[PDB]
Design an enzyme around this catalytic site. Structure first.
Site, mmCIF file in Angstrom:
data_model
loop_
_atom_site.group_PDB
_atom_site.id
_atom_site.type_symbol
_atom_site.label_atom_id
_atom_site.label_comp_id
_atom_site.label_asym_id
_atom_site.label_seq_id
_atom_site.Cartn_x
_atom_site.Cartn_y
_atom_site.Cartn_z
ATOM 1 N N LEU A 79 13.998 10.965 54.859
ATOM 2 C CA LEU A 79 14.868 11.184 53.696
ATOM 3 C C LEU A 79 14.880 9.857 52.953
ATOM 4 C CD1 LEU A 79 16.196 13.170 55.972
ATOM 5 C CD2 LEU A 79 17.655 13.715 54.057
ATOM 6 N N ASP A 123 28.594 8.146 66.904
ATOM 7 C CA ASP A 123 28.339 6.924 66.151
ATOM 8 C C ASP A 123 28.182 7.227 64.644
ATOM 9 O OD1 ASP A 123 27.926 4.148 65.750
ATOM 10 O OD2 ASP A 123 25.793 4.240 66.314
HETATM 11 N N1 ATP Z 1 14.857 9.813 59.064
HETATM 12 C C1 ATP Z 1 15.083 8.759 58.344
HETATM 13 N N2 ATP Z 1 14.523 8.630 57.100
HETATM 14 C C2 ATP Z 1 14.676 7.632 56.273
HETATM 15 N N3 ATP Z 1 15.263 6.494 56.547
HETATM 16 C C3 ATP Z 1 15.971 6.524 57.791
HETATM 17 C C4 ATP Z 1 15.877 7.633 58.744
HETATM 18 N N4 ATP Z 1 16.601 7.240 59.987
HETATM 19 C C5 ATP Z 1 17.196 6.096 59.654
HETATM 20 N N5 ATP Z 1 16.826 5.549 58.412
HETATM 21 C C6 ATP Z 1 17.323 4.405 57.752
HETATM 22 O O1 ATP Z 1 16.792 3.253 58.372
HETATM 23 C C7 ATP Z 1 17.852 2.299 58.545
HETATM 24 C C8 ATP Z 1 17.978 2.101 59.946
HETATM 25 O O2 ATP Z 1 18.389 3.219 60.702
HETATM 26 P P1 ATP Z 1 18.942 2.984 62.162
HETATM 27 O O3 ATP Z 1 19.408 4.302 62.491
HETATM 28 O O4 ATP Z 1 18.072 2.209 63.064
HETATM 29 O O5 ATP Z 1 20.077 2.094 61.560
HETATM 30 P P2 ATP Z 1 21.717 2.342 61.407
HETATM 31 O O6 ATP Z 1 21.650 3.857 61.118
HETATM 32 O O7 ATP Z 1 22.441 1.620 60.268
HETATM 33 O O8 ATP Z 1 22.339 2.114 63.044
HETATM 34 P P3 ATP Z 1 22.088 2.896 64.513
HETATM 35 O O9 ATP Z 1 20.796 2.253 65.007
HETATM 36 O O10 ATP Z 1 23.186 2.761 65.324
HETATM 37 O O11 ATP Z 1 21.898 4.450 64.029
HETATM 38 C C9 ATP Z 1 19.131 2.840 57.796
HETATM 39 O O12 ATP Z 1 18.831 2.920 56.356
HETATM 40 C C10 ATP Z 1 18.929 4.335 58.066
HETATM 41 O O13 ATP Z 1 19.745 5.075 57.174
#
Ligand code: ATP
Ligand code: MG
Length: 294
Positions: A79, A123
């Site tokens: 996304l 979370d």
């Molecule tokens: N499926 C996805 N598509 C696009 N970008 C994503 C996706 N999953 C995560 N991200 C983006 O990448 C970044 C890192 O995600 P990550 O989930 O590692 O970080 P966080 O969500 O802030 O913390 P946590 O690791 O606890 O979920 C944030 O912008 C997240 O919204």
């Protein structure tokens, strides 16, 4: 990984680095999460594989799980933007209420689906909520906390945020329910409206106290069993409850009524996601398209 051409590093989280990557056997762009050492816990790998079957339009789809070389990589649908980025973009004008109501409505649909399958997120935060150009919003990283057991510092020593953490978790409660997700959603809902985090705590105690100064220090009348909580101290300062009209202006009665139900101290009193879908606040929900700029 060999089947993926990494395009960029979207970011880094508690669980590892996220890369935009293109699948070479399919050309599709996905989100690849390298997960943060004895060959990966068999328990973890069985929990993740359960998730592959949990599909819903408001849940970011877990496409593949790749444990190769005793390494874990999770491939999710990609996304373009997260709600955090979107809010920082709409800070001066604010996210319009019809958009806020559509997003909250869809998030509740996603939660109600996971919750009926006894799957908790635990979370929830703006960075875990993804949106597209069509006006859809999805829950990312659903169930990974279960699988990996949430850490203090992110894979890259970044301090993890407590702002959306429910009070029962903060009071040391080990067996928390689906209500924890409702509390988090409540906090995000209020942030969207006011454009300011409800409880921006910088320590577990500061977090608890910010909650207490606003909602009042809980006692046995409002939260039965609270005084027997592991981390509860008789020495907690006693604060009175502030008026919600003062906490979330300019949210109308319906919104305020919904938010107070989401923020009930007692997890058993807290409104469920399915009951919240029937709240009169959603009487007129619609599906507007955001103002995205990729
Ligand atoms: N499926 C996805 N598509 C696009 N970008 C994503 C996706 N999953 C995560 N991200 C983006 O990448 C970044 C890192 O995600 P990550 O989930 O590692 O970080 P966080 O969500 O802030 O913390 P946590 O690791 O606890 O979920 C944030 O912008 C997240 O919204
Ligand atoms: Mg995340």
């Amino acid at each position: 990984m060999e089947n993926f051409q990494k395009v960029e590093k979207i970011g880094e989280g508690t669980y590892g680095v996220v890369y935009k990557a293109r699948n070479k056997l399919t050309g599709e762009v996905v989100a690849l999460k390298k997960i943060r050492t004895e060959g990966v816990p068999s328990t973890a790998i069985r929990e993740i594989s359960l998730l592959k079957e949990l599909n819903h339009p408001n849940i970011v789809k877990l496409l593949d799980v790749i444990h190769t070389e005793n390494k874990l990589y999770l491939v999710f649908e990609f996304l373009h933007q997260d709600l955090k980025k979107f809010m920082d973009a709409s800070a001066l004008t604010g996210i319009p209420l019809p958009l806020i109501k559509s997003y909250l409505f869809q998030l509740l649909q996603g939660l109600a689906f996971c919750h009926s399958h006894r799957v908790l997120h635990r979370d929830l935060k703006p960075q875990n909520l993804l949106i597209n150009t069509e006006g859809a919003i999805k829950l990312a990283d659903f169930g990974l906390a279960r699988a990996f057991g949430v850490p203090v510092r992110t894979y890259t020593h970044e301090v993890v945020t407590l702002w959306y953490r429910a009070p029962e978790i903060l009071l040391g409660c080990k067996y928390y329910s689906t209500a924890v997700d409702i509390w988090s959603l409540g906090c995000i809902f209020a942030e969207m409206v006011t454009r300011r985090a409800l409880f921006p705590g910088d320590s577990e105690i500061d977090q608890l106290f910010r909650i207490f100064r606003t909602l009042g220090t809980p006692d046995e009348v409002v939260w039965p069993g609270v005084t027997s909580m592991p981390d509860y101290k008789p020495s907690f300062p006693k604060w009175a409850r502030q008026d919600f009209s003062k906490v979330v202006p300019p949210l109308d009665e319906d919104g305020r009524s919904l938010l107070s139900q989401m923020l009930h101290y007692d997890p058993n009193k807290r409104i469920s996601a399915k009951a919240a879908l029937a709240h009169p606040f959603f009487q007129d929900v619609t599906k507007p398209v955001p103002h995205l700029r990729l």
